[PDB]
Design a protein around this ligand. Sequence first.
Ligand SMILES: [Ca+2]
Ligand SMILES: [Ca+2]
Ligand SMILES: [Ca+2]
Ligand SMILES: [Cl-]
Ligand SMILES: [Cl-]
Lengths: 151, 151, 152, 152, 153, 151, 150, 156, 151, 151, 152, 151
Amino acid sequence: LADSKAVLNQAVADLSVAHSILHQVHWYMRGRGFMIWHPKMDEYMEEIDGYLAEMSERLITLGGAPFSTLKEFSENSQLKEVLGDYNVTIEEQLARVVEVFRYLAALFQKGFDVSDEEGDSVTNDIFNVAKASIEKHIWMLQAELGQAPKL
Amino acid sequence: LADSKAVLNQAVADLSVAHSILHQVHWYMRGRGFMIWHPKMDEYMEEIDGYLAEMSERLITLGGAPFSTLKEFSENSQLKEVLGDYNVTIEEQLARVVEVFRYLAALFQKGFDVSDEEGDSVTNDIFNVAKASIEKHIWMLQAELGQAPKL
Amino acid sequence: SLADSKAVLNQAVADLSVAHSILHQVHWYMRGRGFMIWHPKMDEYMEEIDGYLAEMSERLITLGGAPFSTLKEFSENSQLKEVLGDYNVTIEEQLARVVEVFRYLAALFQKGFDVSDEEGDSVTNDIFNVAKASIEKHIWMLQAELGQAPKL
Amino acid sequence: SLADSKAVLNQAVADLSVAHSILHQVHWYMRGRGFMIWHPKMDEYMEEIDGYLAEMSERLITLGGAPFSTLKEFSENSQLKEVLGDYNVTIEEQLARVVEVFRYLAALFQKGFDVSDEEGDSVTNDIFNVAKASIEKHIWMLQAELGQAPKL
Amino acid sequence: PSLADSKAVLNQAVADLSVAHSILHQVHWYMRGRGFMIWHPKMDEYMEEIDGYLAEMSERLITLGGAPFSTLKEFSENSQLKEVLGDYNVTIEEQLARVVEVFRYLAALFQKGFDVSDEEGDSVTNDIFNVAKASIEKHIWMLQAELGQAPKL
Amino acid sequence: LADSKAVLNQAVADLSVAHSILHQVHWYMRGRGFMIWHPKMDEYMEEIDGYLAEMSERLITLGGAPFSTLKEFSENSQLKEVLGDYNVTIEEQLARVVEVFRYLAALFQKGFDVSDEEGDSVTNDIFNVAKASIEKHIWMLQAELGQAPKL
Amino acid sequence: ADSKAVLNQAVADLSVAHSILHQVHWYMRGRGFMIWHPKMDEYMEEIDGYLAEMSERLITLGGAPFSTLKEFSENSQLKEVLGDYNVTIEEQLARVVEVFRYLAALFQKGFDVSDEEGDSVTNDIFNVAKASIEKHIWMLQAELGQAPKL
Amino acid sequence: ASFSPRPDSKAVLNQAVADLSVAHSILHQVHWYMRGRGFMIWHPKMDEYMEEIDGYLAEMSERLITLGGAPFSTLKEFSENSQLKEVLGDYNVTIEEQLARVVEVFRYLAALFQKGFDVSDEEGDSVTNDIFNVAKASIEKHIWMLQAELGQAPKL
Amino acid sequence: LADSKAVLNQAVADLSVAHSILHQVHWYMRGRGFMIWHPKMDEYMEEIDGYLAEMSERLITLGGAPFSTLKEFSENSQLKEVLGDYNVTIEEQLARVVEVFRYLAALFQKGFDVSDEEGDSVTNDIFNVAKASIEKHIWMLQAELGQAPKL
Amino acid sequence: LADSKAVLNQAVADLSVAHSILHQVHWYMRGRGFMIWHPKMDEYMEEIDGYLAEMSERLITLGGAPFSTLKEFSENSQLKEVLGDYNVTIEEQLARVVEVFRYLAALFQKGFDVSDEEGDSVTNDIFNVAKASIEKHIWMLQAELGQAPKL
Amino acid sequence: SLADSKAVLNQAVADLSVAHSILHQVHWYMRGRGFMIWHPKMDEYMEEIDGYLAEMSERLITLGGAPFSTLKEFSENSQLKEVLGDYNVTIEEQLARVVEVFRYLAALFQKGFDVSDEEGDSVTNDIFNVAKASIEKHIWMLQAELGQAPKL
Amino acid sequence: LADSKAVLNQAVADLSVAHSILHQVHWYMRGRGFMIWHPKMDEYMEEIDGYLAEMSERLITLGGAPFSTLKEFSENSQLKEVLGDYNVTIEEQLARVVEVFRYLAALFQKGFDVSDEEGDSVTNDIFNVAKASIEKHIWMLQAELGQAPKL
Ligand SMILES: [Ca+2]
Ligand SMILES: [Ca+2]
Ligand SMILES: [Ca+2]
Ligand SMILES: [Cl-]
Ligand SMILES: [Cl-]
């Protein structure tokens, strides 16, 4: 992951698995707070989809070839998936979302660094904008869980 | 179409009493979650009013005569009302709404079946659409309570 | 100190609930020339009555009262009288029924205005004033359709 | 399998085309008290009829059929009869004409439902059910304006 | 070339539309009878449309170097429309027929405005009058139809 | 002006003449600030029309008979009109609008007081709301003119 | 009398034009379908708008609009044919051009007749319709690689 | 070059300018420092409350200016003339305590608006009287809802 | 796929793979018509996400457990994925979309039939509504390709 | 036909230079009134662009060939441009806009006359509508400058 | 260590809070020709200042900081000085005061840009860049009203 | 900031000529695809006008003096214009747009570099955002032509 194209493709894989994890959280959620957090997962999925559009389009624009099959996403992503379980508590589900978002914020920092080293300023801006928004979500999720952001 | 007319009128009575119960829950709600659930009861009331419109209008269209006094609603409905009470817990209020919705979904199954037996496809569809949404709400309310829909 | 304002707000909860029921009967059983305009107009009036019901019930809860909240309580405490629906009522008779209900509500709202003013409950007083204003405007328009002066 | 479903979709293409023309005649030639309500109301009904024409023609094409698509085909295949426009028709005679058209359409839509309910094309079946529901609701309202029961 | 007559007819329209607006307001306020609920707000739509022609025609007069009438005295004195005291006892049919008469007058005035501006070569003014006449004549057809009558332009 | 009906009808006349004066200011305006103040007169005319609607409708509702001819407006209004003149400065035009608004605010105080005495609380509120807005405009116009409101 | 006759001619011809456009919309296949199929809907809505304007003006003038499919079909100068899927996009768009050239010519006739009669309201309705139809002719022709050739 | 002279309807309007400015600051503190279950509904609710407070500040400051007054218009003036007390922000506060703080601020404001209602009524300034009445109505509705979240009766 | 729950879960897997395939077509598209069909794939992706929401939520509501990992989607779907290739023509890409949509319409017919025999009229309607819309897309794509729908 | 096409093409050149002049006025404006008049130039530019669209499209429709290079616009326009200068007063700027608009209104009268002579009624209407609005702007600009329109 | 980025964000919280107060003073005490344009313009500028306050305070919280959140803290930490309101200030003087505040904010935002670039806090860096761009554009417009170049 | 100012003014000239070229393509377009690409040129012109506003305003803000005559735009732009020609193929028109956009993207990279060198971070962002969008359009135009972006 030492060129802009490679880190954008890593993000295509990781955002695709993150979307799948968010969807599991949305579907399997139970507990007090469901009525606010279940639809919130749809907002986060739309957010992730937007990152995926910006980063995939930029990769194509640069002459790359985005991963575009579930096998590629699953094999390249560093995120791990588990079977859905309704008995996970809402506190646990929100903590899972924070863990996913911390990973994405770290990936986006890597993308920011790789693109800055290569002078790809457009790609650098894409990762900076996505990092800003995801870190704001981490502050809010952590605040609901009674915690500091701990970036 | 005597039985289709009869089940549409039963729904007019039951939806009228359901709306009154939801209004009670809206007004008397106290406890953590109030700010989400108090306005949610307004959304459920608006939806119940929409079914009351659809079903009353269809009954009139079929040559029936809708119940249209409080006495007729209360005496024909199988839902029981009790005095308002601020000390019902918020989770008990949600379970009250689940009980009302389980009753409505069962009524709408009966309506679906009666209208099918009398060949009244328009009435059958009104009950089918209403049942779908009420069952979806039962899932969400049960999820907030940490439980399965049990439908 | 505000027992009477609370009592008149709860009277309004009952009467607005029965008024809504009567308006619904008019909406459903209406037949006659003018149906196409007055049938949906009843829906507009029902939505407005629901608005006053929200304002007045919320104010009652806010003052530490307990709104009537069952159909039996509305029926027993309202001063309005319901009758079985009948398609043979003329559309002019239906509109006159609405005027009668509205004249009662305007009178109830004046009572609420006076009681709340006596007790110094200026917020409740304004709720009854705004509601009375609009109901009276409706009485003018309904009466005008019926070829009459408002007769307030 | 699909023959009856396609045939009734095409019948509906012809009948809806002629119904649209009849409603346009009513819209244009209308005179009398109620004009200002009922003249624009015919535009609303015409837009609804055009909506069903789009749904039904599109499903027919989708199923491999070929919609009627000339005025001659519409006129020859429709069971509705058109007459010269006449400004002397009374407004209640115009509304009765619309009710007659709508009763025919509701019966056609019931036929469409009947050939597609188990047998035939399930998507066609939903289209005809939604259309029948709305037309029957209009028959109630038109009949109510005329002081009558729906008499379905 | 002199646009004195295009200016004069625009100003005549300023006065007449002002008085027409007042008559329509009277109809709106004093209306009683079956049909009130559709025709009372309809008079508001008509007032708004009359106000729009007032804006178009006054602005064009000003643009042409004219001086619009701008006092009630000037409107009342220069208008050819006559006003009567408001009366709640006028039937809906009579009120609609009064509006028809006002509108036939306006359509006639706008035809005069069309002809004068055409003769003076003022094509912008000409178009303003043409567009206003078209809509007023459409309303006359609709009002007359409510009254069970042909437009009879 | 004896009673609520009478003061409402006085306002019908005075608002009608005020609208005419505002229209004159709108049409005849010339000078720096035209592009702000010419459309502002349209806003003020629309506000005036709104009070005319509220007050006329209330008068009809009370069983009165609104003035409804130009002769009645002109004869009963206390406002005086003069011929339009392009040579009036914009600051004189705005001062003329202030004068009209001070008159209306004073009339609406009279309407407030008469209706209060008669126990006509609905009419009372109409006059109070209208006075509030007109006085706010007097502040703003006076400020443009470099002066205190001086109510 | 002549303005009324040409308005009614337009009622018939616009009715048939609408039917032809609908045939084009329904039977369309070929590359370009996804842009041109919904474009026919826009043209149909525009044609219905002219039909409203022209029929209402005719009624307003004391005329009696054609108001039956048989009257439209018999009085229109446009010819309809059975619908067929085996028509290329270029032939479909050329059909639309032919119908629009006809309408633009009819609207010019309406303009001339109304001008002669001094019916300026009717004159303007024909002028506005002709302007828009001619703009569509340019675009359709351009898609076909052609000049407008009015 | 002196402090605003200590002073009627103008005086209570200016008191409200100071108190609303401090109430806004306290709501903003609650918004920023909020943690605990309920954050996702109450954090944005504070923004709605701040916008509402800003609305009253506009109504009341504009009325004061219209009456020939001179609103407080510096942070020193708001802080020193307000009866509300601010404390340093702290993340360790529970949702229940945060909402209780908002209730206390709103009870104070409703009491101030009753005083403004009473003064303006005595003076015959009916426009000012209505501004205070409308603001009081909405604040008291919020007190009911906040209290209901806390399981409490409104106690108004 | 013997009960409604099983066919709804099959749809969860197949819609998830169909979404991935549509995303590939969106990204790798080249040829005349790109400017209209590239954004059309976004519309189809949103349509598929809509089907997925209706069907997953109904499965949860019925007491089932949706597939919710990429491994589950890949393994259970009958749709096959291939590596992205820019050197596929737009005609080939649209034909690929038609193939996917024919499969989904056939799945929705299976779901319609299973739910119909169970008397699960709500689930039956979800499949019928999705059938109707996807088959309308097949008509349009085929028409662009110069062909009959050939359902 | 030839003369209408020639006047429409003249308008394409003149509107292009007028747009450039108005942009200069927008950019170099300084003085009291900037905050009203700077954005007003944008409204005027948008309106000029609208006439450029109408007149160029009509020219193409008639079989003509619009000027479509800056060289053609500058060489064929009758309007003269000068270097931008911040030192111009607001009132001098507005006067420059009035001069441009007077020229455009005269050109549109010529276009109206020529198209009327040729019987090109569609072209005639385009010039008439454009002239009407430009003359209304001349009234308002002149009013701001304390003057009559002086058409 | 993001000590310096946190510190400059908190400096902005204080300074934006005082700037909002100064703009509110200008809005309230404004008199003179141009009032009708510049009085509401101050509301737009206040809304903009409040937007930057939200962006910068939220970023500070997200980074683990603790925003100033009392009026005493804002006043004591801000570098901007407030004076008592005065109706007798001319429009030109009021606008010049706003320019001076905005020049200060732009310089603060350049400091925040610099500090955050040095510390590698690219998200904070972008927040200050976007705010500086807009404030500088306002300086151009205000100076242009005042007959002057921006003189950044 | 002399060189940041100069590159902004270069962009004012270049964007003005690019808008003229895009207008020519819009007007003279003939061939299959006209109906999608003709209005597309309007979107691209509106976007170019947006950059012209951002860049000109920034130049004014920095104390510069934007080019503001057609002569200055033509003299300073490096884009060459030719006479309009209806017989250019539609695919050649799209390739002409790609050539103009490759030039603009190179100009914007130069603007990014010069402003970064001079420490003008605001101007730097303006150029980065504009370059990102133009590069995205090059991908899409190239894809229509069946080819890679080839940045
Ligand atoms: Ca950005
Ligand atoms: Ca409790
Ligand atoms: Ca060619
Ligand atoms: Cl509880
Ligand atoms: Cl070509």
